[PDB]
Amino acid sequence: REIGILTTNKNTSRTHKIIAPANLERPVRYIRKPIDYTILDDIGHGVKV
Amino acid sequence: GRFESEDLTSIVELDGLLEINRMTHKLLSRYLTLDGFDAMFREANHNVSAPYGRITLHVFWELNYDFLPNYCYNGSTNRFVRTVLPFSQEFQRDKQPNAQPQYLHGSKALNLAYSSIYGSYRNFVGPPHFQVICRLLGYQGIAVVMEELLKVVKSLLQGTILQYVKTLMEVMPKICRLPRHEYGSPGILEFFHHQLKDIVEYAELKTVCFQNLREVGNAILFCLLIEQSLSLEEVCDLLHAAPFQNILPRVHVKEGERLDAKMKRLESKYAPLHLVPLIERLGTPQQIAIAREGDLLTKERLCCGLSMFEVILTRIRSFLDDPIWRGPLPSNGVMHVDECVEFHRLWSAMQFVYCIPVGTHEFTVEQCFGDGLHWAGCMIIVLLGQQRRFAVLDFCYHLLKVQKHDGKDEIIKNVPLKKMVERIRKFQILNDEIITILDKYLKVRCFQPPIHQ
Amino acid sequence: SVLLEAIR
Amino acid sequence: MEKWIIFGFILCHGILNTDATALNLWKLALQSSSCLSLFRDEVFHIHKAAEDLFVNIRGYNKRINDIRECKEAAVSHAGSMHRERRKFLRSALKELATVLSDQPGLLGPKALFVFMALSFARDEIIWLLRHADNMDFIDKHIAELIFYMEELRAHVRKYGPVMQRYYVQYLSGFDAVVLNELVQNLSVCPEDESIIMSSFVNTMTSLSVKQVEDGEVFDFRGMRLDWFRLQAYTSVSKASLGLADHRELGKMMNTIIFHTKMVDSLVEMLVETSDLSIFCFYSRAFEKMFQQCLELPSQSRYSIAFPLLCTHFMSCTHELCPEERHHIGDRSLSLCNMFLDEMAKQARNLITDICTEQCTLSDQLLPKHCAKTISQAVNKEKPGVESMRKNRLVVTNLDKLHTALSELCFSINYVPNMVVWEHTFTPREYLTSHLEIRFTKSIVGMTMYNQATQEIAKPSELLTSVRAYMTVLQSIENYVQIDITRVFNNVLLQQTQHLDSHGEPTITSLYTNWYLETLLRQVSNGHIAYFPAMKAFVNLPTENELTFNAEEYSDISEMRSLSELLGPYGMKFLSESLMWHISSQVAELKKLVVE
Amino acid sequence: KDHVCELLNTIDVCQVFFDITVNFDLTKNYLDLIITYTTLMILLSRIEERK
Amino acid sequence: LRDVLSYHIPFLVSSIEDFKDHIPRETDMKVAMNVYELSSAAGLPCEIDPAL
């Protein structure tokens, strides 16, 4: 008890060298599309056509 | 009593003699019914009727009067050594007692042999001495010694060190800019040497201020090292209680085996060694209560989830309540830059003082004061929260940077430039290490934008 | 410290 | 800007001959470099290609001489100029980062400084990187530059709310007022321009700090795109509200857009100014730099920077090419793992050298070294002298090792963990693992067991060396946030069993085998005897000379050291090994009795 | 390439005013598009078996 | 081993010695063997060696 005055809990924890995500980066396919010039008209004061 | 009339380095010879005495008691006990060695030792140490014993009292006396003011720390080897030209010779230790050879190691030849064996521990203090000190002082003595060291540091910081700080703050320059690179390295050295002339020529500096700073640094280093030794003994004590407490090691499961069932087989192999259940099954209620209490004491040690150094540092921070340390509020409302009203600038000036090469007839700072001086200075800087400002704003670091840039070398007021920058670099390394350790052990003011008229 | 007085 | 100038003035080469400003800009850019970056790894060699292009044209002959002179100037001076720039930037960013960490509130008023510094550092790094591989191109201190870039980025990430508050207040207080003053002072404006500017003012005046305190997520993509739209509307010839006549409005809106970015677009700014994902396509040089950093002790302070660059790699991908995303992700993970592993490896190597030095120091205190003194005292160098520092300019091996170890442990402890493609790496677990493995190997290697000559180390000397190792390891908690008690517990409780968790001989097995198959065997032969006087086994003075002393292993001190090392588990194992032999002998005795 | 050429012709006929200091985004994006177009053409020129 | 243990973990050792010394002499072999096995693990000397 006498020595306990000078003490304080130290923060040390166990961990792993690497921790992986719950769900990995599932890859996605490349689907070709043409250049669509009408995809920014809902941002700001758009000018449709 | 033979310990009480010798320096701190004789603790090893003390525990050696105590072990000889314990072996003698064990041998004679085969035929005679004597008092337990613990009872005899406590009676001889005055530790029966009183909390602390003679050994710990002399340990504290030695610390205070001979260890803090006379020893020099070495960071790399982790050892203390006595200073050259010692500052204190007023110890006046008790006169050595004498007796027949059979009260010492046992005979004239044995006395000579053991004296020769233990004479090797006399001219340094290191890990072995701390092991013996911890092992002999226990929690009681360790706690009391640390409290008394805290009192010593409080007395020193709010006493003589404060007065010298105030005086030197009066003597320091009011404003000191860090010149530009274009000024040159020789010019910058000359400028610094002119500005800090009064501090450089202060006679009592190196002989009083540095002495007290060395004392403070030695005290904090002792606290750190003694804590490390205590932890190292606690871990070993726990490694020996494992069999009777069921702490098995991780076992190697070969191909086609189950770790859980394997560990269960190992546990049931060793189940006869487990003490508490065995006494519970076969013992008496009083025996069971005592066994439970003893097991609880045994398994709970400071090494597993407690620390002491940080509390010491916080307590020491509580001592710097005078306004001289931190100074007045900055004019621009952010931080002082060209002013010298904060402790870290005083320490920069002192660093300039002791980074200058000295004559051969004189002693260097590490020859007289060791590493405790810098531990004390960097502790004071870090506790006040001035470490980063110190790093950014510092005369010696600035000179080192500019000289590295332009790569000049001359002599200014009999101070070679290249040697001085080399010394500055060495001390920069040491200071960075100390600051980093102190930061490790310790684990917003917003501003308003302009308003349109 | 005061323990110094006591030991003295 | 370099690429703009070079390629643009090649494309409009007709103007180099008529405008002096164009020619001077082009010449400056030309002498500023020797190869451009067509893509992440692709490069374009400027001065050969330009001359080839211009040789055919007949009106350009002074241009070829200009190009050749610029080529000579580049080769001569560009490397030195950029070396000096890197030198300057290292100290500049050290200063800036230190001051900002000291006063985190200045991130508001001085954000432009942070982003300017990041841009300059990134530019220098990529210039060096692309010039080193092609055609003063070795920088030994690049780790410091990268480290302080990373530290500035960390500051921006931790203290984002400070800048958000500062610039929300800036906008809604000062910019709204000044912009409304300027707009109301306009004379004639069409409908759409007026609506856009009114929207600017109205969105600016609706901000409040309370939103930042609550934790709202702002969105100014519409406002930025509207300013860009209005630029388009007013910049075309034959426009009512021509912008060539209202330059002050353009400048004010550029400043306002910067403030809007500082509110809600901080991470995009970080990627825009300080992205070093180009190292994913310079892997060889990247690892060479890591190795060169680890070699130097002073620079090893900044080794943590390299594994922290692996978090930048995912920024180099795109939506129009999702094939390579996985490939890039796999490379980043592997590189980060390799870097952290190598760092832990030199950590353990330095610790091992220090432990060797400390064992040598601690064996000089053994009683066996006091024979000369006792002999001299009867018939008729010293420890602690190695620690006497006369001067600090003389460096011993132990202090070099100490400096290197502390300097590297600073970096191993810099950040608790990093996330790379959603995997969390903890750099100190690598150190813990390596320390455990090396500690076990060294424990079993210090026993010096030799079967070919039934030699072994004395128990007490092994205990002394083990304690020296434990002290050196305990000293590592000064620098890293590891828990060394865990390492001690695992390693030293595995050595009390017959075999370790890795199925290898621990010291219990080695010492039991030696004590039974050498000591007691030779005792049964007749070369040793048990002296109850000395509580030991002592070689008898026979004709043969056993290659060991039985009293130096069975003495009271030696047996106590063995007990310290082995513990109740190891001592139980030893006792069982002995009772096996007793049972064998009793079986033979029973045979003799029955016959 | 074809869309880029069309947009460049449009900008040419509209007679736009470019100043990096006044209309930063317009000039930046214009020069970015031109440089990306040129670099794309060269990187295409460097694939030996496109034919 | 006894000298080391009585010095590292005094409380367990004191409990073990108290338990061993004062076991009733009228107990049978089954319990006394477990008691002696614990004691021998602790390093104390026993009249009947359980390992043997």
Q: Could you tell me the CA-to-CA distances from D559 to B24, B357, B415 in Å, in that order?
A: 18, 54, 61
| Distances B339 to B178, B196, D448 between C-alpha atoms, Å | 11, 14, 63
Q: Do D493 and B422 touch (CB under 8 A)?
A: no
Q: How far apart are CA D263 and CA D211, in angstroms?
A: 12
The one-letter amino acid code at B116 reads: S
Sort B154 into a burial class: Cβ within 10 Å, 0-12 / 13-18 / 19+. Answer: middle
| Contact call for A18 and D423, based on CB within 8 A | yes
Query: Hey, what are D585's tokens?
Result: 């002998």
The CA-CA-CA angle for residues B139, B141, B145, to 5°, reads: 115
Q: What is the DSSP string of E1-50?
A: -HHHHHHHHHHHHHTB---TTTSHHHHHHHHHHHHHHHHHHHHHHT-TT-
In angstroms, rounded to a whole number, what is the distance separating the alpha carbons of residues D386 and D357? 12
**CB spacing of A7 vs B311 below 8 angstroms:** yes
- Give phi and psi for B17, each to the nearest 5: -65, -35
To one decimal, the resolution in angstroms is: 3.0
Residue of B nearest to F4 (CA): B240
Instruction: Write down the H helix ranges in B64-209.
Output: 108-118, 127-157, 160-171, 185-195, 197-200
Residues of chain D neighbouring F43 (CB-CB closer than 8 A): 563, 568, 571
Cα–Cα separations (whole angstroms), residue B138 to B234, B252, B283, D240: 11, 38, 31, 91
Which residues neighbour D494 within 8 Å (Cβ) at sequence distance 6 or greater?
B249, B250, D440, D500, D501, D506
Query: Is B239 within 8 Å of D493 when comparing Cβ atoms?
Result: yes
Q: Show Cβ contacts of residue D330 under 8 Å, excluding neighbours closer than 6 positions.
A: none
3-state secondary structure of D291: helix
Q: Which residues pair with D424 in a beta bridge?
A: A19, D419
Distances (CA, A) of D106 to B190, D163, F34: 34, 9, 72
Which method was used? cryo-EM
CA B298, CA D297: separation in Å to the nearest integer?
43
What chains are in contact with D, requiring at least 3 Cβ pairs below 8 Å? A, B, E, F
Distance of CA D194 to the CA centre of its chain: 53
* B100 CB burial (10 A radius; 0-12, 13-18, 19+): exposed
Find where tokens 């040690």 sit: B301
Contact assessment for residue B349 and residue B399, using Cβ atoms and an 8 Å cutoff: no
Backbone CA torsion sign across B340, B344, B349, B352: negative
Determine contact: E36 vs chain D, CB below 8 A. Answer: no
Burial class (CB in 10 A: 0-12, 13-18, 19+), D244: middle
Q: Which residues of B297-336 are buried (b: 16+ CB within 10 A; e: fewer)?
A: ebeebbbbebbbbbbbbebbbebbeeeebebeeeeeeebb
Cα gap F12→B241, rounded to integer Å: 8
Q: Which two tokens stand for residue D55?
A: 């040789």
Are the Cβ atoms of B306 and A12 closer than 8 angstroms?
no
Tokens of D169: 């207040």
Q: Are F42 and D571 within 8 A, CB to CB?
A: no
| Separation of alpha carbons D175 and D168, rounded Å | 10
Going by beta carbons, is chain F in contact with chain B, meaning 3 or more pairs sit under 8 Å apart? yes
Distance in angstroms (rounded) separating the CA atoms of residues B122 and B119: 6
The nearest CA of chain D is from the CA of A1 a distance in Å of: 23
**Residue among D399, D410, D417, D437 nearest D343 (CA):** D410
The chains in contact with chain C, meaning 3 or more Cβ pairs closer than 8 Å, are: B
Reduced to 3 states (helix: H, G, I; strand: E, B; else coil), residue B137 is helix
For D227, nearest residue in chain A (alpha carbons): A44
CA distance to B201, B349, D507, per residue, from B198 (Å): 5, 10, 65
Give the gyration radius of chain F's Cα atoms. 11
Q: How many CA atoms lie within 13 A of B36 on its CB side?
A: 4
Q: Measure CA of the first residue to CA of the last residue in chain B; give whole Å.
A: 83
Structural element, H or E, at residue B72: strand B71-74
Other C-beta atoms closer than 10 Å to the C-beta of D592 total 7
Q: How far apart are CA D85 and CA B403, in angstroms?
A: 18
Q: Which of residues 13-52 of F touch D (CB under 8 A)?
A: 40-43, 51-52
Structure tokens at D187: 């004379």
- Rounded distance between C-alpha atoms, residue B233 and residue D324, angstroms: 55
Contact B417, B410 (CB under 8 A): yes
- Residue D93: exposure state from Cβ atoms within 10 A (0-12, 13-18, ≥19): buried
Q: Describe chain B by its helix, strand, coil percentages, rounded to 5.
A: 65, 5, 35
Chain C interface includes B151 (CB < 8 A): yes
Q: What is the dihedral of CA B394, B397, B398, B400, to 10 degrees?
A: 160
Which residue, among B77, B10, B379, has the nearest Cα to B215 in the 3D structure? B379
To the nearest whole angstrom, how far is the Cα of B57 from the nearest Cα of chain A?
A: 17
CB D410 within 8 A of CB D301: yes
**Minimum distance, in Å, between the CA of residue B113 and any CA atom of chain A:** 39
Q: Which two tokens stand for residue D459?
A: 């128990």
**Using the beta-carbon criterion (under 8 Å), do C3 and B60 form an inter-chain contact?**
yes
CA angle D505, D435, D442 (to 5 degrees): 40
DSSP H or E stretch at residue D342: helix D324-363
Contacts of B451 (CB under 8 A, 6+ apart): D173, D174
Residue in D490, D500, D512, F51 with CA at minimum distance from that of residue B273: F51
Q: Pick the closest to residue D153 from D124, D128, D125, D117 (CA basis).
A: D117
Set of chain B residues whose Cβ sits within 8 Å of the Cβ of F42: 244
CB atoms within 10 A of CB B3: 21
Q: Work out the angle between the directed axes of helices B210-245 and F29-42 (0-180°, nearest 10).
A: 160
> What distance in Å separates the CA atoms of residue D229 and residue D80, rounded to the nearest whole number?
44
Residue corresponding to tokens 């072995």: B128
**Inter-chain CB proximity D425 and A17 less than 8 Å:** yes
Q: Look at residues B312, B300, B42, B370 and name the one whose alpha carbon lies nearest to residue D388.
A: B370
A23: Cβ contacts below 8 Å, ≥ 6 apart: none
Nearest Cβ partner for D471 among B80, B232, B364: B232
Contacts of D202 (CB under 8 A, 6+ apart): none
Q: Hey, which residues does D548 pair with through a beta bridge?
A: none
Q: Please give the C-alpha separations between residue D439 and each of B50, D348, D489, D492, E34, in angstroms, as whole numbers.
A: 44, 9, 12, 9, 61
Residue linked to tokens 């580049």: D74
For residue D54, give the amino acid letter.
Answer: F
Q: Cβ-count burial of D445 within 10 angstroms (0-12 exposed, 13-18 middle, 19+ buried)?
A: exposed
Angle D53-D59-D65 (CA atoms, 0-180°, nearest 5)?
65
Per the CB < 8 A criterion, the answer to whether B249 and D490 are in contact is yes
Please, which residues bridge with residue D418 across strands?
D425
Query: From CA B430, how far away is CA D296, in angstroms rounded?
Result: 17
Question: Is the CB of residue B76 less than 8 Å from the CB of residue B150?
Answer: no
Contact D244, D253 (CB under 8 A): no
Cβ–Cβ under 8 Å, residues D401 and D357? yes
Residue of B23, B237, B240 to mutate, testing the F interface (most F Cβ within 10 Å of its Cβ): B240
Cα separation, F26 vs B11, in Å, equals 49
Q: What angle do CA B372, D470, B245 make, to 5 degrees?
A: 125
State whether residue D320 sits within 8 Å of chain A by CB. Answer: yes
For the stretch D171-206, what's the b/e string if a residue is b when 16 or more beta carbons lie within 10 angstroms of its beta carbon?
A: bbbbbbbebbeebeeeeeeeeebeebbebbbebbbe
B429 touches chain D (CB under 8 A): yes
Q: Which residues face D530 on adjacent strands?
A: D537
Q: What is the DSSP string of D31-94?
A: HT-SEE-SSSS--EEHHHHHHHHHHH-SS-SHHHHHHHHHHHHHHHHHHHHHHHHHHHHHHHHH
CB-count burial class (<10 Å; 0-12, 13-18, 19+) for E46 = exposed
Q: Which of residues 252-311 of D touch E (CB under 8 A)?
A: 254
User: Would you give the end-to-end CA distance of chain D in angstroms?
Assistant: 107
φ, ψ (nearest 5 deg) of residue B6: -155, 165
In the block, which residue shows the tokens 């470099």? Answer: D33
Residue F36 Cα to chain centre, angstroms: 5
Q: For B259, list phi and psi in degrees, rounded to 5.
A: -65, -40
H or E stretch including D424? strand D423-425
Cβ <8 Å between B151 and C7? no
State the Cα torsion B147-B148-B150-B155 to the nearest 10°: 150
Torsion of CA B133, B135, B141, B146, to 10 degrees: 60
In chain F, the residue whose alpha carbon lies closest to the alpha carbon of B284 is F19
Q: Is F5 part of the contact surface with chain D (CB cutoff 8 Å)?
A: yes
Query: Which conformational region is residue B138 in: left (phi greater than 0), alpha (psi within -120 to 50 degrees), or beta?
Result: left
The distance of F37 to chain D (nearest Cα, Å) reads 10
Q: Could you tell me if B95 lies within 8 Å of chain F, comparing CB atoms?
A: no
| CA distances from residue B149 to B142, B373, B394, C1, D572 in whole angstroms, order as listed | 11, 16, 31, 9, 45
Q: How far apart are CA D161 and CA D594, in angstroms?
A: 94
In the numeric block, the tokens 């405790």 are attached to B372
User: In this complex, is the C-beta atom of E12 within 8 Å of any C-beta atom belonging to chain D?
Assistant: no
CA distances from D443 to D358, D434, D440 (A): 15, 14, 5
Q: Cα(D322)–Cα(A36) distance, rounded to whole angstroms?
A: 20
Contact (CB, 8 A) for D168 and D208: yes
Cβ burial, residue D453 (10 Å; 0-12/13-18/19+): exposed
DSSP assignment of B200-247, as one string?
Answer: HT-TTIIIIIHHHHHHHHHHHHHHHHHHHHHHHHHHHHHHHHHHHHT-
Burial class of residue B55 in the structure, from the number of CB atoms within 10 Å of its CB (0-12 exposed, 13-18 middle, 19+ buried): buried
Chains E and F are in contact, defined as 3 or more C-beta pairs closer than 8 angstroms: no
Taking CA–CA distances from B83, the nearest residue in chain D reads D388
Q: How far apart, in Å, are the Cα atoms of D381 and each of B176, D80, D386, D387, D538?
A: 49, 51, 9, 12, 33
Strands D423-425 vs D528-531: parallel, antiparallel or unpaired: unpaired
Q: Report the residue of chain C nearest B60, measured CA to CA.
A: C4
Contact D70, D61 (CB under 8 A): no
Structure tokens at B14: 């003390």
State how far the alpha carbon of D301 is from the alpha carbons of A26, B238, B284, D297, D336, in Å. Answer: 38, 36, 61, 7, 17
* H/E run at residue D529: strand D528-531
CA-to-CA separations, D161 to B88, B202, D107, D153, D264, in angstroms, rounded = 57, 49, 10, 14, 10
Cα distances (Å, whole numbers) of residue B231 to B35, B224, D63, D123, D526: 32, 11, 77, 50, 47
Q: How many CB atoms lie within 10 A of CB D87?
A: 15
Rounded Cα gap, residues E25 and E34, in angstroms: 14
Which residues are bridge partners to D537 per DSSP? D530
Tell me, what DSSP letter sits at residue D175?
A: I
* Residue that has been written with the tokens 């007023």 in this structure: B90
Beta bridge partners of residue D367, listed in sequence order: none
Tally the residues of chain F.
52
Distance of CA D255 to the CA centre of its chain: 37
